[PDB]
Swiss-Prot record:
Ranges where the MIF4G domain occurs: 12-201
This protein's name: Eukaryotic translation initiation factor 4 gamma 3
Quaternary data: Interacts with EIF4A, EIF4E, eIF3 and PABPC1. Part of a complex with EIF4E. eIF4F is a multi-subunit complex, the composition of which varies with external and internal environmental conditions. It is composed of at least EIF4A, EIF4E and EIF4G1/EIF4G3. EIF4G1/EIF4G3 interacts through its C-terminus with the serine/threonine kinases MKNK1, and with MKNK2. Appears to act as a scaffold protein, holding these enzymes in place to phosphorylate eIF4E.
Residues of the full protein shown: 745 to 986 of 1585
Function text: Component of the protein complex eIF4F, which is involved in the recognition of the mRNA cap, ATP-dependent unwinding of 5'-terminal secondary structure and recruitment of mRNA to the ribosome. Functional homolog of EIF4G1.
Transmembrane segments: none
Signal peptide residues on this chain, from the entry's feature table: none
Ranges for region eIF3/EIF4A-binding: 2-204
Protein family (similarity comment): Belongs to the eukaryotic initiation factor 4G family.
Post-translational modification: Following infection by certain enteroviruses, rhinoviruses and aphthoviruses, EIF4G1 is cleaved by the viral protease 2A, or the leader protease in the case of aphthoviruses. This shuts down the capped cellular mRNA transcription.
HEAT repeats, residue ranges: 2-40, 41-79, 124-162, 163-202
Organism, scientific name: Homo sapiens (Human)
Amino acid sequence: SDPENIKTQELFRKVRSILNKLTPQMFNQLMKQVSGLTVDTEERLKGVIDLVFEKAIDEPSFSVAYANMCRCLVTLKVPNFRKLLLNRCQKEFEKDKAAKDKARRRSIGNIKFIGELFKLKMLTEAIMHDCVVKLLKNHDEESLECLCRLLTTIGKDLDFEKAKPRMDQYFNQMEKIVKERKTSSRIRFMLQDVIDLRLCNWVS
């Protein structure tokens, strides 16, 4: 395409610039920055979105920022945003199903980001369940703490009358992890907190 290839180039560079400020940008400045972008193509929206995930995978810690970034991009029409997001998210999942004990570390980062996106309504409760199942699968301290923090924050939202059964199972799997002391008493107290919470109808 040649001349278009040039604008797609500048777009991507502008987006890498936005993401590459060593000091995470807050929402307001994000809206002004994103308004200086031209995402007029699906290949472009998908590329920008890819750029964001790649950054969020490198610095999971700033996933609140990147999620806010995404929150700004969803204010654009292109010849369907959440769809590309979901698709992009399930990519890590559909790929995680394929030191594969270091994949857990990367998995924790991704889930933190995905959870940040879910908190801004850009993702489905269905993908959160995938996350929970993935966290229970790996029963290491990091995964469990991620699980405890996640469920503490979004637990009741996921706890819908129709999801009650799967949630019932998650929590019974956690109690089992407690009962068997192959985990630190610390993680065991954290686990018992999420269980206490739920038993208390998610009221503190």
